[PDB]
Design an enzyme around this catalytic site. Structure first.
Site, PDB file in Angstrom:
ATOM      1  N   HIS A   1      25.114  39.609 -59.688  1.00 27.67           N
ATOM      2  CA  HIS A   1      26.162  39.077 -60.598  1.00 27.67           C
ATOM      3  C   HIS A   1      26.695  37.723 -60.128  1.00 27.67           C
ATOM      4  O   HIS A   1      27.880  37.564 -59.939  1.00 27.67           O
ATOM      5  CB  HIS A   1      27.281  40.087 -60.766  1.00 27.67           C
ATOM      6  CG  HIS A   1      26.905  41.214 -61.656  1.00 27.67           C
ATOM      7  ND1 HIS A   1      26.520  42.426 -61.156  1.00 27.67           N
ATOM      8  CD2 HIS A   1      26.823  41.291 -63.014  1.00 27.67           C
ATOM      9  CE1 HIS A   1      26.261  43.234 -62.164  1.00 27.67           C
ATOM     10  NE2 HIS A   1      26.436  42.565 -63.320  1.00 27.67           N
TER      11      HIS A   1
ATOM     12  N   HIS B   1      30.695  34.674 -68.327  1.00 25.40           N
ATOM     13  CA  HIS B   1      30.894  36.080 -68.773  1.00 25.40           C
ATOM     14  C   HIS B   1      31.066  37.007 -67.571  1.00 25.40           C
ATOM     15  O   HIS B   1      31.489  38.149 -67.785  1.00 25.40           O
ATOM     16  CB  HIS B   1      29.760  36.564 -69.676  1.00 25.40           C
ATOM     17  CG  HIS B   1      28.606  37.128 -68.921  1.00 25.40           C
ATOM     18  ND1 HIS B   1      27.604  36.335 -68.427  1.00 25.40           N
ATOM     19  CD2 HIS B   1      28.316  38.394 -68.544  1.00 25.40           C
ATOM     20  CE1 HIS B   1      26.744  37.089 -67.761  1.00 25.40           C
ATOM     21  NE2 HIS B   1      27.143  38.361 -67.839  1.00 25.40           N
TER      22      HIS B   1
HETATM   23 MG   LIG Z   1      29.720  41.865 -66.511  1.00 26.43          MG
HETATM   24 ZN   LIG Z   2      26.395  40.036 -66.785  1.00 29.19          ZN
END
Ligand SMILES: [Mg+2]
Ligand SMILES: [Zn+2]
Ligand SMILES: CC(C)c1nnc2c(C(=O)NCCc3nc(-c4ccccc4)cn3C)cccn12
Length: 313
Positions: free
Chosen positions: A68, A106
């Site tokens: 991430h 995001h």
């Molecule tokens: Mg996410």
């Molecule tokens: Zn994501």
């Protein structure tokens, strides 16, 4: 003013395709994104000095976690760029502007833990946001960076266009909470099949943009097999670290997150392709026919996981 961004020939051609990989050279990811905004939106959507300063503050607010991270942010924006270029005339000038920024932002300040772990740890963000915990935090961080001196890429927009674009971004980012995906797709299915689905209905657009966001977020399953396979090592490296942390709290993690159960990854990926990815890219192709390559590539990688289970690799 007259300053295009260009890419080397192989990137210039391959960036247009859904399966494109942005590569291992971090210092080109920003120019790659700017390239995409310029071809998607126009050279005049954003003041270039503000855009660049925004991109670098966003990058700085992603963390060095296995999956991430900044690379995921630009991967998800690229996929959204592929969707927008293959569905040119179905989207407003504001949607084009808002959705690429939405994808880049995001997962801002993601720490590599699920909403579940925030809640069981009792992290402050779990008290401040009871559902879509990280995703409400991600939007919050986008507004922070937009308000920094010299960072308002939306300065030229009218008072009301500004509120519309920040509302496009909020829903887009909330939609990346996979808990909200299952509902959203079931409704989108029923509306497409009964013929009720209407793209002039703003709450129908919302749902479609929601599904695009899940598609873009999951696009690692639509890559060439060796990209898909190696990305899986990254996402399991977070899941197992979370598993470790769950055990530290005195809690048996789910198998997904238990590094003692590495052996069962292929079966788990199968489950996820059938429960999540295939349904997602199926419904998205029905609604937006030119996105079919995402479905076809997803199907290919499913078949590649079936092969892994059968000892054929
Ligand atoms: Mg996410
Ligand atoms: Zn994501
Ligand atoms: C790279 C991107 C596109 C990506 N990849 N996966 C994901 C997931 C996800 O839920 N993954 C886990 C799938 C999974 N594994 C087991 C498992 C494994 C070992 C041992 C035992 C059970 C079970 N189930 C369901 C969420 C969001 C993005 N994702």
């Amino acid at each position: 003013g007259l300053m295009q961004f260009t890419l080397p020939v192989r990137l210039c051609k391959e960036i247009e395709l859904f399966h494109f990989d942005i590569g291992p050279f971090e210092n080109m990811w920003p120019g790659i994104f700017v390239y995409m905004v310029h071809r998607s939106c126009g050279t005049s959507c954003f003041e270039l000095e503000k855009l660049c300063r925004f991109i670098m503050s966003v990058k700085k607010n992603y963390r060095r976690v296995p999956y991430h991270n900044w690379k995921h942010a630009v991967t998800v924006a690229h996929c959204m760029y592929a969707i927008l270029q293959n569905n040119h005339t179905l989207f407003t000038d504001l949607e084009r502007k808002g959705l690429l920024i939405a994808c880049l932002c995001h997962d801002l300040d993601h720490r590599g833990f699920s909403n579940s772990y925030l809640q069981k740890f009792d992290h402050p963000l779990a008290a401040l946001y009871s559902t879509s915990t990280m995703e409400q935090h991600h939007f919050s961080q986008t507004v922070s960076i937009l308000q920094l001196e010299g960072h308002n890429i939306f300065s030229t927009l009218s008072s009301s266009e500004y509120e519309q674009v920040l509302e496009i971004i909020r829903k887009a980012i909330i939609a990346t909470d996979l808990a909200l995906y299952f509902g959203n797709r079931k409704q989108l299915e029923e509306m497409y099949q009964t013929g009720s689905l209407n793209l002039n209905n703003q709450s129908h657009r919302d749902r479609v943009i929601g599904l695009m966001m899940t598609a873009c977020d999951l696009c690692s399953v639509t890559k060439l097999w060796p990209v898909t396979k190696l990305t899986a090592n990254d996402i399991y490296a977070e899941f197992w670290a979370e598993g470790d942390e769950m055990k530290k709290l005195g809690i048996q993690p789910i198998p997904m997150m238990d590094r003692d159960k590495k052996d069962e990854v292929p079966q788990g990926q199968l489950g996820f392709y059938n429960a999540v990815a295939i349904p997602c890219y199926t419904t998205l192709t029905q609604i937006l026919p030119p996105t079919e390559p995402l479905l076809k590539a997803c199907r290919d990688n499913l078949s590649q996981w079936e092969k892994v289970i059968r000892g054929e690799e």
